[PDB]
Design a protein around this ligand. Sequence first.
Ligand SMILES: CCCCCCCCCCCCCC(=O)OC[C@H](COP(=O)(O)OCC(O)COP(=O)(O)OC[C@@H](COC(=O)CCCCCCCCCCCCC)OC(=O)CCCCCCCCCCCCC)OC(=O)CCCCCCCCCCCCC
Ligand code: BCL
Ligand SMILES: CC[C@H]1c2cc3[nH]c4c(c3C)C(=O)[C@H](C(=O)OC)c4c3nc(cc4[nH]c(cc(n2)[C@@H]1C)c(C(C)=O)c4C)[C@@H](C)[C@@H]3CCC(=O)OC/C=C(\C)CCC[C@H](C)CCC[C@H](C)CCCC(C)C
Ligand SMILES: CC[C@H]1c2cc3[nH]c4c(c3C)C(=O)[C@H](C(=O)OC)c4c3nc(cc4[nH]c(cc(n2)[C@@H]1C)c(C(C)=O)c4C)[C@@H](C)[C@@H]3CCC(=O)OC/C=C(\C)CCC[C@H](C)CCC[C@H](C)CCCC(C)C
Ligand SMILES: *[C@H]1O[C@H](CO)[C@@H](O[C@@H]2O[C@@H](C)[C@H](O)[C@@H](O)[C@H]2O)[C@H](O)[C@@H]1O[C@H]1O[C@H](C(=O)O)[C@@H](O[C@H]2O[C@H](CO)[C@@H](O)[C@H](O)[C@H]2NC(C)=O)[C@H](OC(C)=O)[C@H]1OC(C)=O
Ligand SMILES: COC(C)(C)C/C=C/C(C)=C/C=C/C(C=O)=C/C=C/C(C)=C/C=C/C=C(C)/C=C/C=C(\C)CC/C=C(C)/C=C/C=C(\C)C(=O)O
Ligand SMILES: COC(C)(C)C/C=C/C(C)=C/C=C/C(C=O)=C/C=C/C(C)=C/C=C/C=C(C)/C=C/C=C(\C)CC/C=C(C)/C=C/C=C(\C)C(=O)O
Ligand SMILES: COC(C)(C)C/C=C/C(C)=C/C=C/C(C=O)=C/C=C/C(C)=C/C=C/C=C(C)/C=C/C=C(\C)CC/C=C(C)/C=C/C=C(\C)C(=O)O
Ligand SMILES: COC(C)(C)C/C=C/C(C)=C/C=C/C(C=O)=C/C=C/C(C)=C/C=C/C=C(C)/C=C/C=C(\C)CC/C=C(C)/C=C/C=C(\C)C(=O)O
Ligand SMILES: COC(C)(C)C/C=C/C(C)=C/C=C/C(C=O)=C/C=C/C(C)=C/C=C/C=C(C)/C=C/C=C(\C)CC/C=C(C)/C=C/C=C(\C)C(=O)O
Ligand SMILES: COC(C)(C)C/C=C/C(C)=C/C=C/C(C)=C/C=C/C(C)=C/C=C\C=C(C)\C=C\C=C(C)\C=C\C=C(C)\C=C\CC(C)(C)OC
Ligand SMILES: CCCCCCCCCCCCO[C@@H]1O[C@H](CO)[C@@H](O[C@H]2O[C@H](CO)[C@@H](O)[C@H](O)[C@H]2O)[C@H](O)[C@H]1O
Ligand SMILES: [Fe+3]
Lengths: 336, 62, 60, 60, 60, 60, 56, 60, 60, 39, 39, 39, 39, 39, 39, 273, 51
Amino acid sequence: LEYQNLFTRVQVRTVPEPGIPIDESTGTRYGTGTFSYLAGKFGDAQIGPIYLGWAGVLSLIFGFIAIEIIGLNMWASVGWDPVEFIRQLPWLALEPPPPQYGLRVPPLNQGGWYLMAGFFLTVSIILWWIRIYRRARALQMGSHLPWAFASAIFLYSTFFFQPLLVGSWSEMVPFGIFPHLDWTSAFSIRYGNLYYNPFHALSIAFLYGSAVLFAMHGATILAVARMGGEREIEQITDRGTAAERSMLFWRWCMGFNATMESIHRWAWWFAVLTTFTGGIGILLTGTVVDNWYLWGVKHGLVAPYPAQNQLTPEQQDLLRGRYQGTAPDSFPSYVV
Amino acid sequence: MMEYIDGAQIALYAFWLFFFGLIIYLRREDKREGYPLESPQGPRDGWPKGAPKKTYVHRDHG
Amino acid sequence: MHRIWLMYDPRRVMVALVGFLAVLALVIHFVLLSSQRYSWIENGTLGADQAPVGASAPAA
Amino acid sequence: MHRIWLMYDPRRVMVALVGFLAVLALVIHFVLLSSQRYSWIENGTLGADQAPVGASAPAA
Amino acid sequence: MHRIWLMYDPRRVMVALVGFLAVLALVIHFVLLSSQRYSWIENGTLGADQAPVGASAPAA
Amino acid sequence: MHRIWLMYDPRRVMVALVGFLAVLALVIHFVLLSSQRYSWIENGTLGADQAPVGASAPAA
Amino acid sequence: MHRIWLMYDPRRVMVALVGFLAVLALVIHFVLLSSQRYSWIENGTLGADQAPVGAS
Amino acid sequence: MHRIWLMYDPRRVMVALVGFLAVLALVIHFVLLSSQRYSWIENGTLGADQAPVGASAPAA
Amino acid sequence: MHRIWLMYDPRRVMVALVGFLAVLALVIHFVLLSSQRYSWIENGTLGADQAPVGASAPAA
Amino acid sequence: GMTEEEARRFHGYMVTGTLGYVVVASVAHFLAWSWRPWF
Amino acid sequence: GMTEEEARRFHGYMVTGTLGYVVVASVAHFLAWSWRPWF
Amino acid sequence: GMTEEEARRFHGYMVTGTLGYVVVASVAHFLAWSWRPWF
Amino acid sequence: GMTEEEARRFHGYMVTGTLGYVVVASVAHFLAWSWRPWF
Amino acid sequence: GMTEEEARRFHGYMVTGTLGYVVVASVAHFLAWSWRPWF
Amino acid sequence: GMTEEEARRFHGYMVTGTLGYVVVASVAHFLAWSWRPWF
Amino acid sequence: AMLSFEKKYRVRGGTLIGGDLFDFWFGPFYVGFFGVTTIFFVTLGTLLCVWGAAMGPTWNLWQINIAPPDLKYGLGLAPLREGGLWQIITLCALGAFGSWALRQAEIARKLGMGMHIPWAYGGAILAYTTLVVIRPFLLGAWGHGFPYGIFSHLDWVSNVGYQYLHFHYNPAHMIAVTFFFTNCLALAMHGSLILSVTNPPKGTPTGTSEQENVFFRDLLGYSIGAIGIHRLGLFLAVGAAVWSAICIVISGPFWTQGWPEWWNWWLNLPIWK
Amino acid sequence: PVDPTTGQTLINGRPVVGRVFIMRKTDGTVKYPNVADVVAHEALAPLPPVV
Ligand SMILES: CCCCCCCCCCCCCC(=O)OC[C@H](COP(=O)(O)OCC(O)COP(=O)(O)OC[C@@H](COC(=O)CCCCCCCCCCCCC)OC(=O)CCCCCCCCCCCCC)OC(=O)CCCCCCCCCCCCC
Ligand code: BCL
Ligand SMILES: CC[C@H]1c2cc3[nH]c4c(c3C)C(=O)[C@H](C(=O)OC)c4c3nc(cc4[nH]c(cc(n2)[C@@H]1C)c(C(C)=O)c4C)[C@@H](C)[C@@H]3CCC(=O)OC/C=C(\C)CCC[C@H](C)CCC[C@H](C)CCCC(C)C
Ligand SMILES: CC[C@H]1c2cc3[nH]c4c(c3C)C(=O)[C@H](C(=O)OC)c4c3nc(cc4[nH]c(cc(n2)[C@@H]1C)c(C(C)=O)c4C)[C@@H](C)[C@@H]3CCC(=O)OC/C=C(\C)CCC[C@H](C)CCC[C@H](C)CCCC(C)C
Ligand SMILES: *[C@H]1O[C@H](CO)[C@@H](O[C@@H]2O[C@@H](C)[C@H](O)[C@@H](O)[C@H]2O)[C@H](O)[C@@H]1O[C@H]1O[C@H](C(=O)O)[C@@H](O[C@H]2O[C@H](CO)[C@@H](O)[C@H](O)[C@H]2NC(C)=O)[C@H](OC(C)=O)[C@H]1OC(C)=O
Ligand SMILES: COC(C)(C)C/C=C/C(C)=C/C=C/C(C=O)=C/C=C/C(C)=C/C=C/C=C(C)/C=C/C=C(\C)CC/C=C(C)/C=C/C=C(\C)C(=O)O
Ligand SMILES: COC(C)(C)C/C=C/C(C)=C/C=C/C(C=O)=C/C=C/C(C)=C/C=C/C=C(C)/C=C/C=C(\C)CC/C=C(C)/C=C/C=C(\C)C(=O)O
Ligand SMILES: COC(C)(C)C/C=C/C(C)=C/C=C/C(C=O)=C/C=C/C(C)=C/C=C/C=C(C)/C=C/C=C(\C)CC/C=C(C)/C=C/C=C(\C)C(=O)O
Ligand SMILES: COC(C)(C)C/C=C/C(C)=C/C=C/C(C=O)=C/C=C/C(C)=C/C=C/C=C(C)/C=C/C=C(\C)CC/C=C(C)/C=C/C=C(\C)C(=O)O
Ligand SMILES: COC(C)(C)C/C=C/C(C)=C/C=C/C(C=O)=C/C=C/C(C)=C/C=C/C=C(C)/C=C/C=C(\C)CC/C=C(C)/C=C/C=C(\C)C(=O)O
Ligand SMILES: COC(C)(C)C/C=C/C(C)=C/C=C/C(C)=C/C=C/C(C)=C/C=C\C=C(C)\C=C\C=C(C)\C=C\C=C(C)\C=C\CC(C)(C)OC
Ligand SMILES: CCCCCCCCCCCCO[C@@H]1O[C@H](CO)[C@@H](O[C@H]2O[C@H](CO)[C@@H](O)[C@H](O)[C@H]2O)[C@H](O)[C@H]1O
Ligand SMILES: [Fe+3]
């Protein structure tokens, strides 16, 4: 019943909408500001003009062609049927090359479009990084954001380098909603349960810690927003009672605290380390360790359970299978 | 030819040394406000000792 | 040489040094203890010619 | 060497030293207690000739 | 020797000491209680000649 | 020895004491109830000649 | 002996005490209720010589 | 006796009481309904000698 | 050349240099320790004629 | 808060409330016992 | 803050209530012991 | 804050409460021993 | 903080109590050793 | 901070405590050695 | 911050302590080599 | 010890239970009645975890495994060495987490803060309570809870997922994952922005809310604003835990088949059946 | 061994008052020593692919 600061009953509007302050060359602001009533009820109201420059324009051209290649291959895979393109959409994929090609260029239908879409997507992501970096400099800001984004790009690039290091493009992630989840599950199966990869475990701890911190910090700032705690830059340069009370809450709760500035460093590192430890864990997989559960047995991670079955010595020879080979390329008659 | 030592383990201790270094750095940053602590036995710094309080240059006029 | 201690505070360097030597010593001891040849807590009483040795080059 | 106590507050150094020694002692005891040869809570009453020894290099 | 209590508030040392001794004692009891030889709740009535002993090194 | 009550607030030493004893009592009862020899709720009516005794394997 | 109520306001003790005893009584009943010998909801009619004994 | 209602707000104690009794009544009915002997919605029409009973101790 | 110390603070450079050298040395040592040829803790005593060598044959 | 006479009259209802509740429960237990006794 | 005669008055009730509870609990154990002894 | 007089008074109850508790505990242990010795 | 006279007085209790605790523990090890020696 | 005479005084205890500790550890190692040598 | 004469006094302790440490470590390698040479 | 500004805040009052009785600090920590109950349950639960390690096969931290009972025990307490200990530790956990949230409410009331932090933590408690209370209750046996062990509980997560053949296809799980990933992205942007205006390149003036607002608006096309980003971060982080609770409670109690075949309703919409 | 006189277990030749059971850790679980030991309880390694 006490006002919760979750919703704003009274917005105000300025007849002019703010523009961009400085450094308009090699690129210019597109559009002009407008106000959204819904966005203005969640948060701030101005849907703005936007900046691209050279890097942003090129990023969109490369990224459009990548997405266009993905979609057209998906749509071709249901025979151009537009009803099936929508009905089956999350099952559709643009799929990596066949394994026996290794790193060679594959046929166009058999993964040649995949590598082309993957190349343009990668260039598009790098140009978008350059855009963000240039824009941070032009606004006279620190480069904290482009290095945060570089950590995500690092994990993304391991989905290129680990297939390269194991020596086959067939090991790459298919472009598709459910297909890339099929790949994600099968990758953990092939490499013997990724739960025992310790860099995967670290990445999870930082993924969970990022949710812990944004829950704690989000709730903390809303609990003092009645005192201007959300004006964080002002609280950092001119500590008010809102900053003092949020420091004391955590000190009295758990025995130590951050500051209004340094809480944002904790946030930054927990997010960044999620994808950085993740990338390392991928790059070790199939290159250094091929069965993570057995690595866990070696290093003492695996809890012992009582045996569910016991094999006789002849069953140990009978129940070994074969490694999976090639599919049969003929349709046998059994007539004789 | 080391049987027990392997690259995944080597990487993991490399990370632990960085991470414990990082926690120290963050706990130094966390003490730029409110420290040194008041105590009936005089000032206290905790550990690590905090980084000094920053002074912020305001935008000259606008 | 001594002017290094004007560029750096000896209070910081000495704690950095102690921390470095602590970590380095523990790394070398635990690497050795994990080896076969120098797992001295299990095999320290073996004489030098009885202690494990890694396998030679293959011979055929 | 007593002027090390003018570089560093002895009240802080002693807490750090007590902390260091406690952690180190517990580490070494737990290393030994994990071993075979020095699993003394189970095999402490064995004679020195009877205690486990880790395997030697095999003879040619 | 008593000037140690000018340096440290005895009111804080006694808290630290009681905390340390409490955890240490619980550690040692649970370690022993997890052992085979000193699992005294199940086996405490056995004579010392009857109590478990860990494996010897085999002679050859 | 009564100076303890000058160093520490008796209102909350006594809360700490009652808390500590309650935790300790519950731990010991749950430990004994986990055992075989002292699962009194199910085997409490057995005489000492019937009561379980733990031993190691006969090691023939 | 009465001076503990000058240290502890009795109205604030008695609410705490009731909670502790309510939980303790519930815990003890459930420990018994799912033991073999004292699962009285299902074997309460047996009589003392027929009731289970945890021998093994 | 009535000075209990001078110590505590009667309104609060009535809400506390009714909440406890409602939850307690629900728990006991669920425990009975979840049992074999008292699963009355399915077996309530059985006579007192045909309602389930939990097994006795063995004869030896 | 010394203008390098005017462009960059030597205090900042020295940390970067020592950091680079320490990492590079640790990388090279563990790469050699992971090899067969140079796994010196296990096989350092072998002597150069019987130290491992990587496979020759391009063919035949 | 409340006056000691107002406390006095409230207590009489709380007592007779508790008594009427116990009475119904006691009859309910005797009915349950007559249908399927538990000892 | 409570006066010493108020504390003394409460203490008499608090002792008597505790001991009455313990007496009732002892009778409950006597019935439980008679029905199914645990030693 | 309590005086050394009050501290001495309080300590007397604390000692006799401890002793009374230790006595009850020791009787409980001797009952437990005679029922089922642990050594 | 404390006077040096107060430091001397506390040190007397602290050393005495520490050694008393070590004496009780040394007897506990005498008994434990007699029952089941660990070397 | 300390005055240098206090630093001089404290060091003498610190050295003696370090010596006393190393001595006890030296006996502990020679007991351990004669029980079960590690070389 | 230090005067140059303080830096010079510190430097000689720091050098001596480093060389002292390296001397002790040299004996440790002499002992380790005598027990089990790594080449 | 106290922060240099702290002392004037250390007033009495704001408790929910106990009043002045426990209204004091111990070092940095506020105690209170729920502090006392916190320490009780934490201590009892932790020592019973150590007891679980002692009677199990190893002291190796990664391998300790205090497992729930067999399903045959249903909703009863099992024998303590057969999973009843896991049940007692679970009660301590519920008591400790509940005491922690109520102690947070007492601290917030003492500082004149809104109740946002206790309720945000309630999201995590809801997920834990779903895993060990609600879902096992709906399945009719406490043995459906996860074991207490650093890696053995990951074995439980693996096996529960494959009980539904392909757990990625669980629709609430897809939403929960999307919240977790979106939260981590949003946290990196919020951290970066505040740091980059407060720590600009050397010789640049300190930034402003306007610069932060302009840059953010080039990233997403719209201004979120200062309170908006903290609302978003709270919505994302707590929504992730709530959708996690949903995704696990529907798995078993409500859906029993493989998760891929749940999507059959989408394939059979009448416009394209 | 059991004493024929009294039906009573003898440990190291001397009697035990009680009902002797062999102590084991929870459910008889035993820590995995090695990868080799884990692999020794498994089937042999799979045969090579048919390509
Ligand atoms: C998994 C990936 C993600 C995992 C993510 C994990 C993130 C964890 C981040 C938080 C960890 C630090 C917590 C903290 O700072 O608490 C304050 C306390 C004291 O310093 P202060 O606050 O500045 O000053 C107050 C004090 O000086 C005087 O206060 P007062 O007189 O009122 O009270 C008495 C004293 C007594 O001191 C203590 O009791 C300290 C005991 C600390 C033990 C726990 C250390 C955990 C380290 C974890 C990092 C790592 C260790 C290896 O002060 C207090 O009572 C303070 C009570 C603080 C209670 C904090 C409890 C935190 C438990 C965290 C457990 C985390 C488990 C994961 O700090 C410390 O004692 C030292 C902590 C130093 C930072 C850790 C750096 C470790 C680097 C590696 C070892 C370095 C060796 C040289
Ligand atoms: C059966 C399934 C396996 C499994 C298999 C894997 C695999 C395989 C991987 C992970 C990875 C991760 N897993 Mg796992 N995982 C399992 C179980 C779990 C559980 C759980 C509760 O059980 C959790 C919480 C997690 C959690 C996590 C994360 C910590 C981690 C991903 C970090 C990240 O931010 O990625 C999300 C962030 C990114 C992908 C970065 C992307 C950034 C780029 C720049 C974005 C480009 C967008 C572009 C511009 C536009 C695209 C347009 C379209 C192409 C049309 N896993 C089990 C054991 N998991 C990853 C990892 O790091 O492993 C070590 C990984 O690769
Ligand atoms: C720290 C780790 C976390 C993280 C961080 C992170 N990601 C980031 C950032 C950061 C800090 C950015 O700054 C960056 C960003 O821009 O954020 C808004 C980004 C980003 N994170 C993204 C996604 C993303 N992040 C993810 C994850 C995470 N990101 C981690 C959890 C995931 C997951 C979980 O899978 C995804 C999918 C993007 C939204 C964004 C990078 C955008 C980008 O690179 O876009 C390149 C451009 C294209 C793909 C092309 C789009 C084309 C359109 C169809 C328009 C076509 C118009 C026209 C036809 C062509 C042009 C014509 C010309 C004539 C004009
Ligand atoms: C709801 C969104 C996310 C969230 C938010 C969140 N967590 C929070 C908060 C908030 C808002 C707090 O205010 C609170 C806090 O104070 O943080 C510092 C907290 C907190 N989140 C924590 C952890 C945590 N949060 C997690 C998750 C999440 N927290 C969600 C994703 C996880 C995960 C996913 O694994 C963990 C481990 C704590 C640091 C803290 C709550 C501290 C607390 O309750 O303290 C009292 C209890 C103890 C100190 C110990 C209790 C010990 C038990 C009695 C015995 C052990 C039993 C246990 C079940 C064993 C488990 C073994 C495992 C190996 C399985
Ligand atoms: C058609 O041919 C393909 C390709 O050989 C067969 O698939 C093989 O077997 C599968 C196990 C595997 O998945 C696949 O990679 C591939 O190895 C497929 O089963 C059909 O087989 C029949 O025809 C085979 C063929 O290739 O002609 C024939 O194989 C035999 O004959 C050829 C030619 O004379 C000879 O080169 C092969 O070595 C020989 N193989 C064997 C194993 O004897 C199959 O005959 C037999 C006995 O296998 C055909 O199979 C049947 C049942 O008719
Ligand atoms: C599975 O088996 C397990 C479960 C495990 C086994 C364990 C079981 C356990 C441990 C059980 C515990 C039971 C228990 C305690 O411990 C039980 C305690 C029960 C009690 C105390 C019940 C009290 C009931 C009282 C009632 C209904 C009152 C009714 C009427 C009222 C109030 C008056 C209405 C009129 C008003 C208000 C107006 C007055 C005038 C006014 C205001 C005016 O005039 O001003
Ligand atoms: C599975 O097996 C495991 C569980 C593991 C085995 C182990 C179990 C363990 C360890 C158990 C420990 C138990 C324990 C330990 O101490 C239990 C302790 C129990 C205790 C202390 C109970 C005390 C009860 C006290 C009562 C009921 C008092 C009532 C008072 C009343 C009614 C009057 C109040 C005053 C009034 C109304 C004033 C009116 C006048 C006024 C105001 C005026 O006149 O002004
Ligand atoms: C099985 O495995 C594991 C568990 C691992 C094995 C190991 C276990 C271990 C290590 C156990 C350690 C146990 C231990 C160690 O020390 C145990 C030590 C216990 C102790 C010290 C108990 C002391 C109890 C004292 C009591 C009850 C006193 C009560 C006082 C009362 C009632 C009086 C109240 C009235 C007053 C004051 C008067 C007010 C007047 C006023 C105000 C006035 O006049 O003003
Ligand atoms: C995998 O490897 C594995 C297996 C782990 C193996 C490898 C292990 C390794 C690498 C070990 C390294 C060990 C090491 C390295 O340096 C260890 C170094 C240890 C050291 C330095 C110990 C020093 C101890 C000193 C003590 C105890 C001093 C006590 C002093 C006292 C009591 C007096 C205090 C003062 C008083 C009372 C006076 C007050 C007066 C005042 C105030 C006044 O007058 O004002
Ligand atoms: C597994 O195998 C892998 C790991 C793979 C193999 C590879 C390993 C590698 C790469 C190793 C690299 C090692 C290395 C590289 O640099 C190692 C370098 C080590 C170094 C530099 C050691 C230096 C030690 C210096 C010491 C101890 C100094 C002590 C000084 C003292 C005591 C005096 C203090 C001052 C005082 C007392 C003055 C007070 C008075 C004052 C102030 C007054 O009076 O004012
Ligand atoms: C008409 O227009 C239409 C209607 C078709 C437009 C609509 C399009 C639609 C509907 C598109 C739908 C797209 C969807 C649903 C896409 C889903 C994508 C997902 C979920 C992808 C998930 C993961 C993908 C990953 C991780 C891919 C990673 C690939 C990498 C890193 C590839 C790198 C490749 C390189 C660098 C290639 C280099 C080229 C070589 C090797 C040859 O030379 C250097
Ligand atoms: C096995 C151990 C081998 C030796 C270990 C190393 C420590 C040796 C200490 C005893 C030998 C003398 O060591 C010597 O001490 C003197 C003071 O006493 C130090 O001298 C230091 O303080 C004096 C003033 O007091 C300054 O003038 C001098 O410039 C400064 O270095 C020397 O730097 C150190 O070299
Ligand atoms: Fe913020």
